[PDB]
Curated annotation (Swiss-Prot), chains A, B:
Superkingdom, natural source: Eukaryota
Key word Metal-binding present: yes
Protein name per its UniProtKB record: Alcohol dehydrogenase E chain
Binding site for an alcohol: 48, 67
GO biological process, one term: retinoic acid metabolic process
Amino acid sequence: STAGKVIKCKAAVLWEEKKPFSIEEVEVAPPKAHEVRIKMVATGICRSDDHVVSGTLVTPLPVIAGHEAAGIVESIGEGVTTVRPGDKVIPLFTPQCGKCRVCKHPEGNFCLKNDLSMPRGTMQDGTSRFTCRGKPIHHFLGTSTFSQYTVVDEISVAKIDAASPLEKVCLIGCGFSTGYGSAVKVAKVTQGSTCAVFGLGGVGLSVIMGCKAAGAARIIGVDINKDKFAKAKEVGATECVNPQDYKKPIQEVLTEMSNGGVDFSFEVIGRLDTMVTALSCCQEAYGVSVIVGVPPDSQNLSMNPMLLLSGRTWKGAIFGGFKSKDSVPKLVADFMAKKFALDPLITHVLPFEKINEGFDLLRSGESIRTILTF
Amino acid sequence: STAGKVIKCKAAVLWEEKKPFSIEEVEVAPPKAHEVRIKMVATGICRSDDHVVSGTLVTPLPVIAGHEAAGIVESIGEGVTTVRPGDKVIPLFTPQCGKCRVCKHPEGNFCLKNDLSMPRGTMQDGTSRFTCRGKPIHHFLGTSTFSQYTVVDEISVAKIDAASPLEKVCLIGCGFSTGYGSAVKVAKVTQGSTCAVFGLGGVGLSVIMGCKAAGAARIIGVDINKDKFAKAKEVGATECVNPQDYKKPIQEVLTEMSNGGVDFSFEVIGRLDTMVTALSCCQEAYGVSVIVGVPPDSQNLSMNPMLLLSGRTWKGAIFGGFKSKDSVPKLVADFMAKKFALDPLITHVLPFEKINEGFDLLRSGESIRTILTF
Ligand SMILES: NC(=O)C1=CN([C@@H]2O[C@H](COP(=O)(O)OP(=O)(O)OC[C@H]3O[C@@H](n4cnc5c(N)ncnc54)[C@H](O)[C@@H]3O)[C@@H](O)[C@H]2O)C=CC1
Ligand SMILES: NC(=O)C1=CN([C@@H]2O[C@H](COP(=O)(O)OP(=O)(O)OC[C@H]3O[C@@H](n4cnc5c(N)ncnc54)[C@H](O)[C@@H]3O)[C@@H](O)[C@H]2O)C=CC1
Ligand SMILES: CCCCC[C@@H](C)NC=O
Ligand SMILES: CCCCC[C@@H](C)NC=O
Ligand SMILES: [Zn+2]
Ligand SMILES: [Zn+2]
Ligand SMILES: [Zn+2]
Ligand SMILES: [Zn+2]
């Protein structure tokens, strides 16, 4: 019944950096050609949403953030062919247009239609579907899921299993898939290897799940918050280390523990120093290090290229390297088939209107994923 | 006739940085257990030997440099099994002990017995076989080929085909195998791909040959010395660009030329800035960039890790990733079967006594490889 009509609903608007989200009445326009309007069912609080608040990630403000979510299609614009009203869907913060050089490449997934490289904070057409008191509100990564309703381009949404539990599978929209894919697809962790995972939040735990799935023999978790260690061990870490406990640099500790360096390391925090530490702690001749964390905007790291000349491989990836529209439905199918677990990531569940309590929990160190429900 | 005796012969000794080599009489001790004394036949002048002179590459002085060579075994120490007197051999500046974790790894080649990471400038037993003016003289990478005779450890020498032409195959001891393998083994260049090669000296020309062997569709040579272009095209470059001809930075030029970035880029110069530029010019989502050049000692580069987060792979390698003792004889066999060419790399041939002229030719931009004959 709301098809073709403006919807008035509640959304969490970020008006300014370093402020709480503000629950506002917003107007959500109907979808234009090749756009899809979605009724939100669940959305995760990812550290990347916090990065918009802290200014770590720069994107036009004011904004509706949120990018890790699942919902049900309320209506479709003209020409939409991949979803229908009533379908369960996951919004895709990395699009899959299927036509650019990256979408056509066997390995690439950073589709050229992304809104990450030079953020505009709009729909593909350069405009917004959100207004608050006659003021346009920016979109975030073409998703914007901190809202009862959002509108996304068709290349930024995937249809998923009609029977999937949205309060869990929303994590496949970012944290799980990023961490799991970073291990299994980007690093290509091998059976019997030794892995080191820096940062034991939702994404790092998912990296551990991937390392375990790949048959790593040793998975060393690294975090300065020792409260994160229990859960890391539950999901597959064989040992955990807190750099604050040592009188020497943790790259040295890890090199000693691993008898000369690890096979695979992962930076899942977002600090320049831990990116270089994670590179250094992998074995100098054949080690691989994968950057997953998002560091502060426009800041460069410093490193000695001899670390690479000896034979190391350094790479990064977005969304675990998964081509998003192809992979998300398959990952949901795999979850339904009990191929991996999502409950270990979910520590808190709150109604959407308690979003700020959810961010308080993340910032305090107490939560992994808070899921916000509608 | 010389077996078991100290040999008096000529060598090019480097007494101090930034000075000419001194051609003088040295005493070369007989080989101890598991060592091999070699009569040198031919040695190339590689930019890395010049880096020892300039202090770009730090190794203990005084030293007998030279590492790209071929010769004939004069005698063997007790317990040597892999070569015999009279055998043609290539010294291996990257050893292959066969026993360490790197030698046993399918991908690694930077054997832990190397003298590169923490240079001692000795034999494996921590002593020197060279005396000059009554003083011990350091070895260089366990090779030291700027001498009529040298002594190497058995893990640092490979027996090659008895019919091979030593005045050519000395290049397999460094510059050819390094560039070729950087393409075919390290980057794993694919059929139909676009490559960019920064630096068109002997090693860069060998990278081109590797890209051609791999079936690259486009191979773009980059050099600030336009005199290098003609040879680069002869060996497979489809285009050459001089950064000095353009107003925009060359990574921008190359990104444009390649319709969004190259599949594979190679830094084959040894500058921090071109390492970052070569990384930047590979396609952001699936590009691969290989560092081959040796930069100034102890200096760090600065880069934005967003270059990696979008999906790029950055790696480096020593000696083209080849396990040295396994690979060198096979490379010689392939050369004898004309699977690749060495003549295009050889622009000058001089007697050993004219070593300083050979270094002048390199420094002036005139030569690719000068081969010194004994
Ligand atoms: N590449 C991609 O596509 C994606 C990147 N991200 C990024 O991944 C990172 C992790 O995200 P979440 O798991 O949601 O964050 P989180 O904040 O829950 O986890 C980070 C963990 O790092 C630990 N930590 C902080 N400083 C540390 C230090 N100096 N040493 C060791 N541990 C330290 C914290 O105690 C925390 O447990 C963030 O930067 C986020 O923006 C997340 C999803 C997608
Ligand atoms: N990784 C490894 O195992 C090895 C590394 N090396 C290193 O590879 C590098 C190349 O060796 P060669 O080919 O013997 O040296 P080379 O000196 O003959 O060639 C370097 C080329 O770079 C060009 N060049 C200089 N500045 C440039 C700039 N700003 N932009 C573009 N081109 C520029 C020069 O004109 C020259 O043609 C050296 O640093 C050497 O030490 C060599 C062999 C083994
Ligand atoms: C790991 C750095 C490799 C550099 C090897 C050079 C010095 N060898 C011969 O040119
Ligand atoms: C290339 C950097 C990728 C970062 C992607 C983040 C912002 N998205 C989800 O958390
Ligand atoms: Zn996220
Ligand atoms: Zn695309
Ligand atoms: Zn070894
Ligand atoms: Zn060399």
